[PDB]
């Protein structure tokens, strides 16, 4: 008889203890294709991005301060890398008679790009 424990608590009562107009799907999407293509501002909210860099650089060297311009350089570079990769993916999709990027479409692009 297989058994498993899920309460994960040796005792109960742990708390009591001492310790309308609507557009068709895609029209708004193309409108803000135009919006984010005519625009130049930076699309990954900064703070969250900076943090991504702190928790990931931590591995290579502790106590590594980053000049502000640097995390802005990492953002720009990351958004440029991903917009280039996403142009390629859309192509890797429009190739297969489709209009929806899918994970496979990007595991391939990166193989032809040779980034893998």
């Amino acid at each position: 008889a297989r058994t498993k424990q899920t309460a994960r608590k040796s005792t109960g009562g742990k708390a009591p203890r001492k310790q309308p107009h609507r557009y068709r799907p895609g029209t708004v999407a193309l409108r803000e294709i135009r919006r984010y293509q005519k625009s130049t501002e930076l699309l990954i909210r900064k703070l969250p991005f900076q943090r991504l860099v702190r928790e990931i650089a931590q591995d290579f060297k502790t106590d590594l301060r980053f000049q502000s311009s640097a995390v802005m350089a990492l953002q720009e570079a990351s958004e440029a890398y991903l917009v280039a990769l996403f142009e390629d993916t859309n192509l890797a999709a429009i190739h297969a008679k489709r209009v929806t990027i899918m994970p496979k479409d990007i595991q391939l692009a990166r193989r032809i790009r040779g980034e893998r």
């Binding site: 991504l52 000049q67 990492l74």
Partner: protein, 79 residues
Amino acid sequence: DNIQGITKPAIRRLARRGGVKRISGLIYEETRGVLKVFLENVIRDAVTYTEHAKRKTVTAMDVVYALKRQGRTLYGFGG
């Protein structure tokens, strides 16, 4: 988890700038890993360069310097 900070709508915004009209739902979490491994390449070299200057702080100059090594130069931040 700081990785989950790269939110869906943000990945959607990157796709929109990239001209994608319908994003699969499984893309969002693929784009994180790809993002991480890439940043994890630049920032690695960014720091090799940093610990060569015996500097403890990193600079944007070292960042564009690591990009030059990888291959993807970045104009607008020095050098």
